[PDB]
Amino acid sequence: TGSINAVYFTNWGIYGRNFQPADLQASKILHVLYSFMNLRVDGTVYSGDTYADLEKHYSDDSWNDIGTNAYGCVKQLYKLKKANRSLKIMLSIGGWTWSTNFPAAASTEATRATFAKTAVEFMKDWGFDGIDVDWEYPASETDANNMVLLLQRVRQELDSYSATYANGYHFQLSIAAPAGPSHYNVLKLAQLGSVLDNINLMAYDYAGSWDSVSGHQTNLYPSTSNPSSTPFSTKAAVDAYIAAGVPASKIILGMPIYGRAFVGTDGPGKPYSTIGEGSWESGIWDYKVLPKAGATVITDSAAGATYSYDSSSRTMISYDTPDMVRTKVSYAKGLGLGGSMFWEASADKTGSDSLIGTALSSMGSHDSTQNCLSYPNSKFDNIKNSLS
Ligand SMILES: Cn1c(=O)c2c(ncn2C)n(C)c1=O
Ligand SMILES: Cn1c(=O)c2c(ncn2C)n(C)c1=O
Secondary structure: OOEEEEEEEEHHHHOOOOOOHHHOOHHHOOEEEEEEEEEOOOOOEEEOOHHHHHHOOOOOOOOOOOOOOOOHHHHHHHHHHHHOOOOEEEEEEEOOOOOOOHHHHOOOHHHHHHHHHHHHHHHHHHOOOEEEEEOOOOOOHHHHHHHHHHHHHHHHHHHHHHHHHOOOOOOEEEEEEEOOHHHHOOOOHHHHHHHOOEEEEEOOOOOOOOOOOOOOOOOOOOOOOOHHHOOOOHHHHHHHHHHOOOOHHHEEEEEEOEEEEEEEEOOOOOOEEEOOOOOOEOOEEEHHHOOOOOOEEEEEOOOOEEEEEEOOOOEEEEOOOHHHHHHHHHHHHHHOOOEEEEEOHHHOOOHHHOHHHHHHHHHOOEOOOOOOOOOOOOOOHHHHOOOO
């Protein structure tokens, strides 16, 4: 019953962004994509921040617990799982920055087995509900085939783990997927659709500093009036995936909780001086600070995009408004897509202007699939006891 509402939570969001797991709208999210784990060329998955993942003590945490115990974001997320049964926690591996070793990690039966075995080990120790593989991106036909083999080996490991320790609980397996044809045309889409529970389409980052002209970063449709503003489109991607034999219900529509800026520009599809400053890096702004004073919010209904434009500073910021999220959900419903996904949690507004909340309101009811609260093989005593 219901729709998927998947949200990236970054483990570095606990520093400088001061965004802790407890701040999530846990009752409005069915999948937390907990990001990221790193990996070696030999397939070994590992924590890139044990402090954030496991060791940080929140005000509730004791220093003198009996045995070996999990703290950090892991314990915090598990707390949320107990209180919100539709909340699945996914172990996200790789990502934009940590995809360099994927080709090698997927390359042999031995490396794929290591990746399986180490990934599931984290899942079963940390009390998570599945694995999300974010390989950006397979380059060759060999990589594409290896990706399928890797995912099948992970599926095998999840199934065997579950038969032994989870009474057949169906742990989940997903990927972050490209909306760029140069990348999705490499993938074995039909095979991916068969093996995976969900395919989270990264329907954003269509425009930025790498473009000669400003553009819409997350538009639904090609612009016929101003095509230089739309180098990509969600529609082309979704159509390609569905035509390939990917079940629409497994496709989850990614949406940005941030804006991409073009400073010193006449508007979409123009010349721009610089991407300018940002919230945490140049040219990217947290949704929660948009729109800025002096900027007007513009809707291009034909392209299916919103953006702010400030004509005095000649600054365009490409981002999704709540009413853009509503429009996108309506598009997704028409195609029978499985739900929504967001990058990333910390930047969202509160109350009704939350993009995460807006999406769920538009979607209707939340995915009823129950999480797992039984981890009898966890090396952490508190996790094995379900924090009871
Ligand atoms: C760094 N990074 C990612 O790694 C990523 C993403 N969307 C999906 N992934 C995996 N976004 C927007 C991102 O900025
Ligand atoms: C072009 N691009 C990026 O530049 C990017 C990203 N995620 C993070 N970054 C930085 N994605 C998904 C992306 O398509």
